[PDB]
Design a protein around this nucleic acid. Structure first.
Lengths: 85, 82, 80, 205
RNA sequence: AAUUGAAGAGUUUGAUCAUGGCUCAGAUUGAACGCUGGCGGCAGGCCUAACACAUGCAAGUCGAACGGUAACAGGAAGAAGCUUGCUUCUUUGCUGACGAGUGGCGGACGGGUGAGUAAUGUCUGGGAAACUGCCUGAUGGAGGGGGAUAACUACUGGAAACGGUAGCUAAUACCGCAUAACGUCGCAAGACCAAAGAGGGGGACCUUCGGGCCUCUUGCCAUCGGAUGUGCCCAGAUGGGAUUAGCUAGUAGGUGGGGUAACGGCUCACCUAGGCGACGAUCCCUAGCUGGUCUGAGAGGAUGACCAGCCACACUGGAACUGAGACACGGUCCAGACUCCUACGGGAGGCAGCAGUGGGGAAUAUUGCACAAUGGGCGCAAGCCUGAUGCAGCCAUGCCGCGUGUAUGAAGAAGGCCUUCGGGUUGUAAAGUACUUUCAGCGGGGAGGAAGGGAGUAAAGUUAAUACCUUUGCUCAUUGACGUUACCCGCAGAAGAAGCACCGGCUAACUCCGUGCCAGCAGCCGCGGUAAUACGGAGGGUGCAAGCGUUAAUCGGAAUUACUGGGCGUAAAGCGCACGCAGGCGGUUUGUUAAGUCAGAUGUGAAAUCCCCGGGCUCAACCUGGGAACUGCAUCUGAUACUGGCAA
């Protein structure tokens, strides 16, 4: 409707696309981690955890994951590897 | 933002402003944290016209509160005594 | 100190938890008679030491399940 | 909002001189007082208990020229004030500005005093008060303005002020044509024949 | 000083006393209707169709973030009529600025409505497992690069709405890289995580002579605090129905995984078989809740329009996206009903914002003026926006104030009505006479709501700088929608200004005439069938008064649900009689506890409202200062007589 709501519509669409991509990459890295924990692999899962840590902290800082969630992930996953190793 | 601001309470064509401390996104005559003085722009030429608790104002500005232009003008009017 | 209550165990049979009846003794607002009045509470206990018919003190904590925001401190008076 | 009719008729239903035509002459002499308040006025009423209470309230209102919602508000204010509600009610009726202008001899009647008050001929404390029911505080000076001073009425009215009893709670002085309401009138200082317990009991039913 | 507070009557009977119902007298209202209507002040105004909506406004702003120039006005340069001295035209964002666009912030506030919701809500009191844009304090960082994409241009699809394709460009847009804590994870060892510039001014130096460089202001990032706001939990309280007694399988709990900002069946797998319920679950009807309002002596009863706090909703049903915050009134998506446009392929809309329409209804307002004030958004500010708000319009809808004159005046005029025809009454009423001008009308004068903001100085601070900026004084023009304002003065003349109900008893106030169980009246008792104080008219009176009556609704009276504060032999009312569980109550003495109870303290019980003492509007209504109050709850400290617990 005829306003500056049109601009918020198009910006929220653009940011929807950007956030969906970054959120999807973050979730795939976390799937790498506890999909490596599905098999009994310690150092493979540690390599995947080191691969996911900067991106989850980074998406926490960029403002789309709200860092407590960031913390939870790494906390949960650390538990999984010292349940395993 | 919390704001020390005026809030219109008198009758029609006869305002009495009460200076309060409100969360700034409330209504004018709505919800406030504490009232801290008043300002009658008439009152008569008698004694006061305005009293205003400077200790609580200094407390809230210490907390981070902002002050509108009228309340700043009233503190600049009642400076310490006059 | 902490605010706590006292009550008696009304039933027992649940997996590391208990349920406690509290007896508050309140005056009727219209009639002026002091009337007994209960408050059943789902109360948590680790390792379920208290059985049925006990008397137990009880404090409030974070939620531990649905209702269940209460946890014991001291089991007294278990006498059967 | 005020009466505007035959006055001596009101004074004749009550059976008592309500001072409604004080004016030039002496005691009535052309009223046929007591005799006939209407066509069947020669009949004795055999009045009820509601009739005596009502008729007492009407006596007082028809004296002071007050209508019912205003009188009723005086009863509420006299009730809430501390003390004796009959005496408080007469103290509220005696502090009226048109009454104080009548007591000082500035008007011949209370309606003439009410027209002096109404036609901006009266100041209190050096400010002109246009209002019949202004409530004169103690230690006030109420006077006539320079306009409507030395008009005939007030002079004649002061001429008939000496025929009356010179109220104790005033400073009547007619030289300067200014007066001082000094204190509230005591119940024993006014009129002696109105029964205010009847109007307390009238409003308290 | 803050509770000075309580009325009855009519009607059962031939009469009585009692019981008992019905009814009246009071106060109130978002009121409507009937008759009447002068002025002002302050308030209030769709209670019904959460029905459908024409039209106009209700949310924008910033160039001191960025590419840029669509206009407007200048500047520079060129050419021309050339009056060689002024105009016309053109290239240049060069400048003040600015359409469109990117970007930041706001559109989650403000404003509306009460549909749903009987307890995921509200009120009161506790709590822990939290997030928090803007605002504030502290500690520090703010280095070095890259790829894009709008706008723009060129085609192109479409009736339109709206797109598509190919190139170009910027940033405080976006992304890496470095850096790394008193940050995250980890027991540690360690691992890992961010950023953005812009503006004002300037001595010297270096200029690829655009600017580097210095300084100030402002912005960015990280962490820890604070304040505010929000999310979550518990206990108690907050309608009616038992002619609704069983309800519940993610249901109740546990373990582990996931999820959220955060605890949690929030979710899933497995294990246990619980959980709720006669202290009323479940079902059904109704309903937004509260501060409060009305009534009441009070306790209560009814209610929750305005004003303020909380919740919920935004055509209907659902969903998420962006964001600090929404599952979003003037956002997105889908579906549905309706309405509209169409080239028939498809599109568009959402007044329960403010005015306004149509409809519904007994009923409820202007398609107004202004941002001057107060507040909000944006902005360094100027300022722009603001149907919030200030005001104005209409309406007796309420409350309050004032007016319609005042004094005199007996020939007790005339006329009306009654009359025992003597007179009485209307009635000092009118007329006459003498005064006054409130308000309305006319003409002048004229506060206050106006504080700020702008432009020059002077001083101080900062600094390399006597710049720039900030602060404080001083000076100069100014800033009012209301508004021919409030108010004051002058003018002319009583001149423009009184109705409505009632008169048998209750209930204040009476006769005549007309009608004759009719016409009709009525709240109850009841009037009217020929001399009606009850009907209709007249005279007279009574009550209220710019109002007055009727109707609807609430409380009172009603001690007719009785807690205060009732009853049960015969008026209604003792189970047909017992036994007895849960429940209620419990002799007497001592000791202990202190739960009830009592006393004090602290925190809270929002503000307004009620009450008290004051203050301002000429008074009043109204506004307002301080107190009291909010009868409560929680915690701590005591007392131990009574009740309870425990022991004897």
């Amino acid at each position: 409707n005829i306003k500056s709501a049109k601009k918020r519509a198009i910006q929220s669409e653009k940011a929807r696309k950007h956030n969906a991509s970054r959120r999807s990459m973050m979730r795939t890295f976390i799937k790498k981690v506890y999909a490596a924990i599905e098999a009994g692999d310690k150092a493979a899962a540690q390599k995947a955890f080191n691969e996911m840590q900067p991106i989850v902290d980074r998406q926490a800082a960029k403002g789309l994951i709200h860092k407590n969630k960031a913390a939870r992930h790494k906390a949960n996953l650390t538990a999984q590897i010292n349940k395993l190793a | 933002m919390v704001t020390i601001r005026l809030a219109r309470h008198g009758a029609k064509k006869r305002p009495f402003y009460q200076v309060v401390v409100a969360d700034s996104r409330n209504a004018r005559n709505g919800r406030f944290i504490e009232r801290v003085g008043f300002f009658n722009p008439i009152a008569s030429e008698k004694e006061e016209g305005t009293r205003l608790d400077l200790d609580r104002i200094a407390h809230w500005v210490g907390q981070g509160a902002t002050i509108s232009d009228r309340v700043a003008a009233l503190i600049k009017e009642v400076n310490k005594a006059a | 100190k902490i605010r706590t209550l006292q009550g008696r165990v009304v039933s027992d049979k649940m997996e590391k938890s208990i349920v406690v009846a509290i007896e508050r003794f309140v005056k009727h607002p219209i009639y002026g008679k002091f009337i007994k009045r209960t408050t059943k509470l789902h109360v948590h206990d680790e390792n379920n030491e208290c059985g049925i018919g006990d008397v137990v003190e009880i404090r409030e904590c974070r939620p531990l399940s649905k209702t269940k925001s209460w946890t014991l401190v001291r089991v007294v008076e278990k006498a059967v | 909002a005020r009466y505007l009719g035959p006055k001596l008729k009101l004074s004749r239903r009550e059976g008592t001189d309500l001072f409604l035509k004080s004016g030039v002459r002496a005691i009535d002499t052309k009223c046929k007082i007591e005799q006939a308040p209407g066509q069947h006025g020669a009949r004795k009423p055999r009045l009820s208990d509601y009739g005596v209470q009502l008729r007492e309230k009407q006596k007082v209102r028809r004296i002071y020229g007050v209508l019912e919602r205003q009188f009723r508000n005086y009863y509420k204010e006299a009730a809430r004030l501390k003390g004796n509600t009959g005496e408080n009610l007469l103290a509220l009726l005696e502090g009226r500005l048109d009454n104080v202008v009548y007591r000082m001899g500035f008007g011949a009647t209370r309606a003439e005093a009410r027209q002096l008050v109404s036609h901006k001929a009266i100041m209190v404390n050096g400010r002109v008060v246009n209002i019949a029911s202004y409530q004169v505080s103690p230690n006030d000076v109420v006077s006539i303005r320079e306009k409507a001073k030395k008009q005939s009425r007030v002079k004649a009215a002061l001429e008939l002020a000496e025929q009356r009893e010179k109220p104790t709670w005033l400073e009547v002085d007619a030289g300067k044509m200014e007066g001082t309401f000094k204190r509230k009138p005591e119940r024993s200082d006014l009129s002696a024949d109105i029964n205010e317990h009847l109007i307390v009991e009238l409003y308290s039913k």
